[PDB]
Amino acid sequence: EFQLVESGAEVKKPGASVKVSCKASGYSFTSYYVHWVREAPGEGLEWMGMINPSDGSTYYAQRFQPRVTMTRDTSTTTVFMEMSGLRSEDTAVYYCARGVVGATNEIDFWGQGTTVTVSSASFKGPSVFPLAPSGTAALGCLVKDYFPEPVTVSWNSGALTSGVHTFPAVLQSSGLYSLSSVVTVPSSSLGTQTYICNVNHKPSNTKVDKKVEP
Amino acid sequence: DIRLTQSPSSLSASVGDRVTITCRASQSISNYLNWYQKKPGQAPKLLIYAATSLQSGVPSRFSGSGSGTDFTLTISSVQPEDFATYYCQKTLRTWTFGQGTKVEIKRTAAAPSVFIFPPSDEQLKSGTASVVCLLNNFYPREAKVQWKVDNALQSGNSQESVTEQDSKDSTYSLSSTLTLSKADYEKHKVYACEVTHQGLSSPVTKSFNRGE
């Protein structure tokens, strides 16, 4: 019933601008502040600023003050966060949140968040390479050179869930991501069982199935 | 204006333990401090507001205290759903967050199972070679991985990732990837991964020889 729906995941070129929207619903719009908080991968929560949708008054963190503009549209009960001069360090999930201020001060309700990725890389499906097995055996799938995030890996559709580790992706110097998914299996199975990684890169409409053989 | 310092950065605990987390303000911020729980892949959840007030629907095991410059968030007995990152937030002027204190699950030491993967033949077709080193199911998190090519220490040319604590055994796993051109890769014979971990008596080395 309370809702703060945020714009969908976005990719923007460095130096460009982004305008994230926050559509509020299920409570009276003018009665709560809207906060914007972000989280870059590997960093802690970062508060950007507030806006009073009643007047349009803003309060920014000094750190975002010259690049970040927050606006609202009361007719559509929607709040906006615009950020200009985007740099890779601006790659984060951006949240909007509903907050009472003054007699009591808290942020009580949160949006789902929006990923903004800042890069010049073009969308690209992954190359999938086998990590061949060499009492238990490990094998896997090296999922190389894709953009953007995310990728999903499952094993055997997925009959195999046990002992699986799909690693967080790394940003390579190329600007493409890369990860490994590994599983442990019985060494006795390598003669009988065929092991397939099912890699799904939704952002590029790419599905790859790579058989991993000893 | 006013800085917030959270302590510790990392903490390990068992179910039913009492955990205490600290936030120190560089100047007096009085009442205006909130505490949040944040798990990966979700928005923060408000636990404590105004330093000492319990947010509705929050279990009693959570409590905050302090005023001025020193704040405490304690969890009386830690329950298994409580393992998350915790943030303090100033709710005055700029609503600055603290750095976060990560509360992870305590367990007995476990040595990593170590594995090395040579590049696949189809990747070599692309003119790139990636050697992957797997460190499986180890505790605690702190570990050290070293790549050695022809017994020469490698530095700054590999990437690594660590999993979060496993949901069943609470261990970590780490993957490290050394990536070279096919040209460079074919210029060397011996690729090695050396790992030191407190669960190991002496450092473990996995390795292979390109032509073999």
CB atoms within 10 A of CB A66: 10
SS3 of residue A6 by DSSP: strand
CB contact under 8 A, A142 and B97: no
Phi, psi of B9 (to 5 degrees): -80, -35
Sequence-distant (6+) residues with CB within 8 A of A20 are: A6, A7, A10, A80, A81, A82, A83, A94, A96, A114, A116
CB contact under 8 A, B43 and A131: no
Which residue reads 């926050």 in tokens?
A22
**Contact B45/B90 with Cβ under 8 angstroms?**
no
In whole angstroms, give the CA distance from residue B194 to residue B143. 11
Report the candidate in B33, B106, B110, B104 with the shortest Cα–Cα distance to residue B67: B33
- Tell me the fold of B107-210: Immunoglobulin-like (2.60.40)
Which residue reads 């080395």 in tokens?
B205
Instruction: Give the HSE-up count for residue B35: Cα atoms under 13 Å, Cβ half-sphere.
Output: 28
Which residue reads 């976060």 in tokens?
B100
Report the candidate in B120, B93, B127, B128 with the shortest Cα–Cα distance to residue B2: B93
Tell me the one-letter amino acid at A179. L
**Contact A99/A108 with Cβ under 8 angstroms?**
yes
Cross-chain CB nearest to B97 (options A44, A104, A179): A44
Kindly list the structural domains of chain A, giving each domain's residue range(s) and its CATH number in brackets, ordered by start: 1-120 (2.60.40.10), 121-214 (2.60.40.10)
Quote the minimal CA–CA distance from B192 to chain A in Å. Answer: 14
Task: Show the tokens assigned to A212.
Answer: 């991993």
CB atoms within 10 A of CB B9: 9
**Contact B107/A117 with Cβ under 8 angstroms?**
no
- Rounded to the nearest angstrom, the gap between the alpha carbon of residue B163 and the centroid of all alpha carbons in its chain is 8
**Backbone dihedral region for residue B184 (phi beyond 0: left; psi -120 to 50: alpha; all else: beta):** alpha
CB contact under 8 A, B115 and A138: yes
Quote the minimal CA–CA distance from A174 to chain B in Å. Answer: 12
Cis peptide before A158, with omega less than 30 degrees from 0? yes
Is the Cβ of B208 closer than 8 Å to some Cβ of chain A?
yes
Tell me which of 3.40.50.2300, 3.40.1110.10, 2.40.30.10, 2.60.40.10 is the CATH number of domain B1-106.
2.60.40.10
**Three-state SS string across chain B, please?**
CCCEEEECCEEEECCCCCEEEEEEECCCCCCCEEEEEECCCCCCEEEEECCCEECCCCCCCEEEEEECCEEEEEECCCCHHHCCEEEEEECECECCECCCEEEEECCCCECCEEEEECCCHHHHCCCEEEEEEEEEEEECCCCEEEEEECCEECCCCEEEEECCCCCCCCCEEEEEEEEEEHHHHCCCCEEEEEEECCCCCCCEEEEEECCC
Task: Show the tokens assigned to B105.
Answer: 């699950």
Experimental method, per PDB record:
X-ray
R_g of chain B, CA atoms, integer Å = 23
Phi, psi of A30 (to 5 degrees): -80, -10
* CA distances, B142 to each of A11, A165, B41, B109 (Å): 34, 18, 23, 11
Domain ranges within chain B, ordered by starting residue: 1-106, 107-210
Query: Which of B 51-90 lie inside 8 A of A, CB atoms?
Result: 55, 87, 89
In whole angstroms, give the CA distance from residue A189 to residue A186. 5
In whole angstroms, give the CA distance from residue B210 to residue B12. 42
Task: Show the tokens assigned to A95.
Answer: 């949240």
**Backbone dihedral region for residue A189 (phi beyond 0: left; psi -120 to 50: alpha; all else: beta):** alpha
In whole angstroms, give the CA distance from residue A120 to residue A171. 13
Partners of A139 in beta bridges:
A183
